Ligand binder design. Sequence first.
Ligand code: HEM
Length: 291
Amino acid sequence: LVHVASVEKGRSYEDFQKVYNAIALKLREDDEYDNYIGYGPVLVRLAWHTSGTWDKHDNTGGSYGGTYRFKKEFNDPSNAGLQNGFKFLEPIHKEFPWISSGDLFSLGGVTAVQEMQGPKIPWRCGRVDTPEDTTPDNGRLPDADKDADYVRTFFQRLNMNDREVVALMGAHALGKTHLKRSGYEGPWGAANNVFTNEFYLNLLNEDWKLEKNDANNEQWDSKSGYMMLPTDYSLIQDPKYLSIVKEYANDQDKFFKDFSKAFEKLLENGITFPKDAPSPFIFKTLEEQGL
Ligand code: HEM
């Protein structure tokens, strides 16, 4: 199936900047969530999980149809906790009922990255809601207890190469694992609602110990109180991933640029943009607008 982007009728960059801004203002206001981490990280994860069901082989899943709104997908065990991001976005959608669900979930992620002082992420509109029966089955999102070979093979289905995978994984600077959600517990670093390359620095520089958490799962833990999932740790066990980790640990701008590309790509898999579609939008942050 071909999913052609269709601009919400009559809308242009200013309409979407208003949606951006409403997301960004609520991110600022609703600051208590998750022990004052705020909603930035879970919105980034919502954008990723709503996009990461894509299968390049048959164009099933992906961000286009906004299918997370249907119970099979919002109740995917892999999506446990993302209901908080959805609930956050509900008043946004009520204010701007014209935006499609896929456009709102993906825009939430862009807005979160940028408001957390991350790179600009160009964003294109035009996702169109598709019906309940287009919701992908559970099981397309990745397991965390696996090795580098798993990770590499997993991401081939999303058409991501080694550099794109290592870049995307840098989002694990953000937020934390929650035991009751994923069976893993702890943050990956100190700056977990500011977008930086800390994930790579911690992988290389902390003294990690392989421990069992209280759900009986193995994770890597440091004396600073940080953790890495087995799939995170695989990025320094595999020599190809390791090189790239070192690159991003040593060049913040490079990480920003590569993350931006990979994240836009993730959010756009599966969508065909007509030749005469608008160019991608680059939203101004609240700070840049003086808001
Ligand atoms: C091999 C791939 C990946 C695996 C196995 C994985 C696994 C996990 C797990 C287990 C959690 C913790 C969920 C919880 O307990 O709340 C998590 C959190 C998160 N992941 Fe991933 N992840 C992967 C890739 C990504 C990518 C590609 C991104 C986005 C670019 C991403 C962004 C996030 C964010 C932002 C959080 C924190 C959520 C929060 O604090 O609520 N992850 N991930």
